[PDB]
Design an enzyme around this catalytic site. Structure first.
Site, mmCIF file in Angstrom:
data_model
loop_
_atom_site.group_PDB
_atom_site.id
_atom_site.type_symbol
_atom_site.label_atom_id
_atom_site.label_comp_id
_atom_site.label_asym_id
_atom_site.label_seq_id
_atom_site.Cartn_x
_atom_site.Cartn_y
_atom_site.Cartn_z
ATOM 1 C CB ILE A 77 -25.483 32.220 25.305
ATOM 2 C CG1 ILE A 77 -24.162 32.690 24.690
ATOM 3 C CG2 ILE A 77 -25.946 33.193 26.372
ATOM 4 C CD1 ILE A 77 -23.583 31.728 23.685
ATOM 5 C CE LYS A 106 -10.967 28.746 28.464
ATOM 6 N NZ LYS A 106 -12.075 29.558 29.057
HETATM 7 C C1 LIG Z 1 -23.684 36.544 25.078
HETATM 8 C C2 LIG Z 1 -23.277 35.886 26.376
HETATM 9 C C3 LIG Z 1 -22.156 35.069 26.405
HETATM 10 C C4 LIG Z 1 -21.753 34.448 27.592
HETATM 11 N N1 LIG Z 1 -20.648 33.655 27.613
HETATM 12 C C5 LIG Z 1 -20.241 33.058 28.758
HETATM 13 C C6 LIG Z 1 -19.052 32.180 28.832
HETATM 14 O O1 LIG Z 1 -18.351 31.956 27.821
HETATM 15 N N2 LIG Z 1 -18.734 31.631 30.010
HETATM 16 C C7 LIG Z 1 -19.458 31.838 31.123
HETATM 17 O O2 LIG Z 1 -19.086 31.307 32.185
HETATM 18 N N3 LIG Z 1 -20.560 32.616 31.140
HETATM 19 C C8 LIG Z 1 -20.994 33.225 30.016
HETATM 20 N N4 LIG Z 1 -22.133 34.033 30.025
HETATM 21 C C9 LIG Z 1 -22.891 34.172 31.263
HETATM 22 C C10 LIG Z 1 -23.695 32.865 31.416
HETATM 23 O O3 LIG Z 1 -24.508 32.648 30.255
HETATM 24 C C11 LIG Z 1 -24.561 32.893 32.677
HETATM 25 O O4 LIG Z 1 -23.752 33.412 33.730
HETATM 26 C C12 LIG Z 1 -25.080 31.536 33.149
HETATM 27 O O5 LIG Z 1 -25.817 30.858 32.130
HETATM 28 C C13 LIG Z 1 -25.961 31.710 34.388
HETATM 29 O O6 LIG Z 1 -26.661 30.497 34.668
HETATM 30 P P1 LIG Z 1 -27.808 30.439 35.789
HETATM 31 O O7 LIG Z 1 -27.930 29.009 36.270
HETATM 32 O O8 LIG Z 1 -27.633 31.553 36.807
HETATM 33 O O9 LIG Z 1 -29.133 30.861 34.982
HETATM 34 P P2 LIG Z 1 -29.687 30.188 33.615
HETATM 35 O O10 LIG Z 1 -28.683 29.227 33.045
HETATM 36 O O11 LIG Z 1 -30.259 31.326 32.813
HETATM 37 O O12 LIG Z 1 -30.902 29.323 34.209
HETATM 38 C C14 LIG Z 1 -32.067 29.955 34.723
HETATM 39 C C15 LIG Z 1 -33.115 28.860 34.733
HETATM 40 O O13 LIG Z 1 -34.278 29.229 35.469
HETATM 41 C C16 LIG Z 1 -35.381 28.597 34.818
HETATM 42 N N5 LIG Z 1 -36.615 29.275 35.249
HETATM 43 C C17 LIG Z 1 -36.959 30.557 35.010
HETATM 44 N N6 LIG Z 1 -38.158 30.841 35.587
HETATM 45 C C18 LIG Z 1 -38.592 29.714 36.197
HETATM 46 C C19 LIG Z 1 -39.776 29.310 36.992
HETATM 47 N N7 LIG Z 1 -40.776 30.185 37.254
HETATM 48 N N8 LIG Z 1 -39.819 28.035 37.451
HETATM 49 C C20 LIG Z 1 -38.834 27.150 37.202
HETATM 50 N N9 LIG Z 1 -37.733 27.447 36.489
HETATM 51 C C21 LIG Z 1 -37.567 28.688 35.970
HETATM 52 C C22 LIG Z 1 -35.069 28.715 33.338
HETATM 53 O O14 LIG Z 1 -35.787 27.732 32.584
HETATM 54 C C23 LIG Z 1 -33.560 28.505 33.322
HETATM 55 O O15 LIG Z 1 -33.167 27.146 33.066
HETATM 56 C C24 LIG Z 1 -22.544 34.659 28.828
HETATM 57 C C25 LIG Z 1 -23.675 35.466 28.797
HETATM 58 C C26 LIG Z 1 -24.066 36.089 27.619
HETATM 59 C C27 LIG Z 1 -25.290 36.961 27.607
HETATM 60 CL CL LIG Z 2 -12.563 32.492 29.110
#
Ligand SMILES: Cc1cc2nc3c(=O)[nH]c(=O)nc-3n(C[C@H](O)[C@H](O)[C@H](O)COP(=O)(O)OP(=O)(O)OC[C@H]3O[C@@H](n4cnc5c(N)ncnc54)[C@H](O)[C@@H]3O)c2cc1C
Ligand SMILES: [Cl-]
Ligand SMILES: CC1(C)c2[nH]c3ccccc3c2C[C@@]23CN4CCC[C@]4(C[C@@H]12)C(=O)N3
Ligand SMILES: CC1(C)c2[nH]c3ccccc3c2C[C@@]23CN4CCC[C@]4(C[C@@H]12)C(=O)N3
Ligand SMILES: [Zn+2]
EC number: 1.14.-.-
Length: 664
Positions: A77, A106
């Protein structure tokens, strides 16, 4: 460029699994290296932003390996992105003509505020994006964005390994020269784990906080938190029966009410496509970006699907983000059998406008595999108290998170990813160039501003979230106070000056405007008043009057002090040039149109005569932007000239900040 099918054929020739065809595109090979300078745990969007920005900021300096447990880029998401994100993509060599083949257009953030006690009554707040010759914003399917960034990383000297998991029980992280021994396996069952000797570990495991949770307990803010439940739906070509006047599908639409809000995001889905075929399509798109292929000579999204044997469909992402002090009836079995389903359908029928809106949409079953018709996530907001230490740092969700609203997760969160990327070069060199104790001490000092920025970032975003939520309890406060203040404080002044060198510095000064003093002053007055009224009650009219008058009095002085020239009346449909609310104002710029053939929203510009999504030719005059109030030919030419290419890095230039001018 003639399209090649390298990965599709390699995968078939060797009967390769998904992870193996992906890992075969790594510069150093499909197996893990014995050693690396940086090891990134997690290839979500921030782990890859970090790695791309680090190699781009200073190429051929750091050896970087990203470890991702998913066998291929997984569902996430978080789909709406903002101009700073597009700018970052453009600075990394991919502009809108190429991104639009993969992602949805967008244009604007738009809000409808539903009156709870007077069902059927609503107000709105409409904003626009930018001309096609200025920039674009994007709605991104996250398995596609993470694939794009994986391939781009592999083409820029970064190794990404899917189907491999950091073992945080046997991993050793410490502050030596290269004290880190990162244990990587294929899972808990794996007999033969590998070790990467390395200097810096980056926790990019998102909300799982897989490393930094070891250093501090997850922190929660006072007061209510939020829950989210969501699903995926069709995307109607004909949006005319949507019950909101002047609705546009290419905006990130917000349906707002006392208990929370609903997001509505139209975006294309590539689900069902083989991973190797997708690698060939993405690789082809990057080769076209390298060659500078014009938009009209680039194949459309649907033609790319035919060429590379892909599945392509239009979907609408629709979800609730509501307060967790909402009272639900005990028995919700009438609205489905899953909790996510039950609360979603229960909430839709609480608002006649939500039910009339949702009746334009057909539910999609299991778009991302079994069990994915419905999603639920509870207690969204949190902060990591410790985000760095000897041998490691954290980025993205791993630092903290608030709420989907205004999309801080990707677009604000990349301030940490890109700053950490820039800081990684001296961190690694310090450790290679000084004895252990002094290196550790100098690195700790270098990261004090990073730690301090993260520490105060999430509380500011949390206050921003509450500010908007409480104002969503009234149909005047939502648009005229909360939205107004977010756009005035948070609009990206001087974004056209940002380059790779200044990006992190600019990004950490933005914070969606949530640090602007007058913004915080109005936000604290509203929260202080509205939080004393129980959620199940209507705000007293006198409280709305007073908050509105307070907000407008602070607004007039703060707007007068801003020295940044903006056609505010062209960008906000409901406001004049001085950001006064204008009841019944309807005029605004028009930057987009809907393809009559496939329904995809398009950017208006004279050199894009065909739909980028299906290839259908527009008649030509449709590509004329509407500037209201008008711009001369000279002013229009001047606008596009400013946004052609970013300025070269000038180490004597003062960084111009995105926030409004101080009042002196
Ligand atoms: C309902 C909802 C709606 C949202 N809508 C928006 C939006 O419209 N726009 C926006 O900008 N943000 C939005 N967000 C926030 C957004 O989803 C996150 O900020 C974003 O996905 C963060 O990405 P990340 O790379 O930090 O972590 P993630 O994308 O969660 O990636 C973490 C990664 O770590 C990996 N991982 C975990 N443990 C291990 C391990 N031991 N070894 C190797 N890999 C591992 C996982 O497989 C995963 O791929 C929303 C959040 C929510 C809850
Ligand atoms: Cl937005
Ligand atoms: C700053 C910008 C990224 C922006 N940021 C917003 C945030 C919320 C709501 C609207 C906006 C906009 C619309 C803007 C206003 N600018 C006028 C000249 C160039 C530009 C850039 C763009 C433009 O064409 N449209
Ligand atoms: C402003 C400054 C103290 C600064 N504040 C930051 C905060 C977060 C991240 C980076 C920075 C920097 C690096 C800067 C950027 N400026 C360009 C012209 C002069 C100067 C001063 C200095 C420079 O040479 N380096
Ligand atoms: Zn079309």
């Amino acid at each position: 460029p003639t399209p090649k099918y390298t990965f599709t054929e390699r995968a078939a020739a060797g009967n390769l699994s998904d992870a193996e065809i992906l890992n075969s595109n790594n510069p150093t090979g499909s197996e893990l290296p014995d050693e690396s300078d940086v090891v990134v745990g997690g290839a979500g969007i921030h782990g890859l932003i970090y790695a791309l920005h680090a190699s781009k900021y200073k190429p051929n300096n750091l050896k970087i390996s990203v470890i991702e447990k998913n066998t291929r880029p997984g569902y996430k998401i978080g789909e709406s992105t903002l101009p700073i994100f597009y700018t970052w993509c453009k600075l990394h060599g991919i502009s809108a003509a190429y991104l639009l083949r993969l992602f949805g257009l967008k244009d604007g953030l738009c809000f409808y505020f539903l009156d709870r006690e007077n069902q059927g009554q609503y107000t709105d707040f409409c904003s626009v994006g930018a001309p096609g010759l200025v920039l674009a914003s994007l709605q991104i399917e996250r398995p596609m964005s993470e694939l794009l960034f994986t391939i781009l990383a592999q083409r820029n000297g970064v190794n990404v390994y899917h189907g491999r998991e950091v073992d945080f029980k046997s991993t050793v992280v410490q502050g030596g020269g290269q004290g880190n021994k990162i244990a990587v396996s294929r899972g808990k069952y794996d007999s033969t784990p590998k070790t990467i000797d390395s200097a810096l570990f980056v926790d990019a495991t998102g909300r799982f906080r897989q490393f930094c949770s070891k250093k501090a307990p997850r922190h929660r803010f006072d007061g209510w938190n939020c829950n989210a439940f969501w699903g995926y739906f069709t995307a109607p070509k004909d949006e005319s029966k949507i019950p909101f006047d002047l609705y546009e599908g290419d905006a990130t639409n917000h349906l707002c009410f006392p208990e929370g809000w609903v997001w509505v995001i139209r975006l294309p889905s590539w689900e069902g496509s083989p991973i190797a075929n997708l690698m060939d399509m993405v690789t082809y798109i990057l080769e076209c970006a390298d060659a500078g292929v014009p938009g009209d000579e680039l194949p459309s999204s649907e033609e790319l699907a035919r060429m590379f044997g892909l599945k392509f469909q239009w979907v609408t992402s629709i979800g609730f983000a509501v307060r967790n002090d909402v009272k639900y009836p005990e028995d919700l079995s009438a609205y489905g059998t899953r909790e996510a389903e039950q609360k979603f359908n229960y909430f839709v029928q609480k608002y006649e406008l939500l039910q009339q809106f949702m009746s334009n949409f057909e539910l999609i079953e299991n778009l991302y595999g079994p069990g994915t018709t419905w999603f639920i996530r509870k207690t969204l907001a949190y902060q990591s108290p410790v985000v760095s230490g000897p041998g490691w740092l954290a980025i993205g969700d791993a630092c903290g998170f608030t709420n989907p609203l205004y999309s801080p997760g990707i677009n604000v969160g990349m301030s940490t990813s890109t700053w950490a990327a820039q800081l990684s070069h001296p961190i690694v060199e310090i450790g290679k160039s000084a004895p252990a104790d002094a290196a550790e001490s100098s690195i700790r000092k270098l990261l004090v501003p990073y730690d301090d920025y993260c520490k105060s970032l999430v509380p500011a975003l949390e206050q921003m979230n509450r500010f908007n939520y409480v104002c969503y309890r009234d149909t005047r406060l939502g648009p005229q106070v909360a939205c107004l203040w977010q756009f005035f404080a948070g609009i990206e002044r001087y974004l056209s000056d940002v380059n790779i060198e200044t990006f992190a510095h600019y990004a950490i000064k933005w914070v969606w405007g949530a640090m602007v003093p007058e913004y915080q002053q109005v936000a604290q007055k509203c929260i202080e008043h509205i939080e004393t009224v129980p959620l199940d009650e209507r705000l007293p009219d006198a409280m709305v009057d007073e908050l509105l008058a307070f907000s407008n009095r602070i607004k007039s002085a703060a707007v007068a002090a801003d020295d940044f020239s903006l056609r505010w009346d062209a960008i906000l449909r409901s406001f004049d040039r001085s950001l006064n609310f204008v009841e019944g104002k309807t005029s605004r710029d028009i930057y987009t149109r809907q393809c009559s053939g496939c329904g995809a929203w398009l950017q208006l510009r004279p050199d894009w005569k065909k739909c980028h999504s299906c290839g259908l030719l527009g008649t030509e005059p449709q590509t004329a932007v509407t500037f209201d109030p008008p711009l001369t030919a000279e002013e229009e030419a001047l606008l596009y000239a400013a946004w052609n290419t970013a300025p070269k890095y000038d180490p004597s230039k003062e960084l111009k900040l995105p926030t409004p001018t101080r009042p002196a």
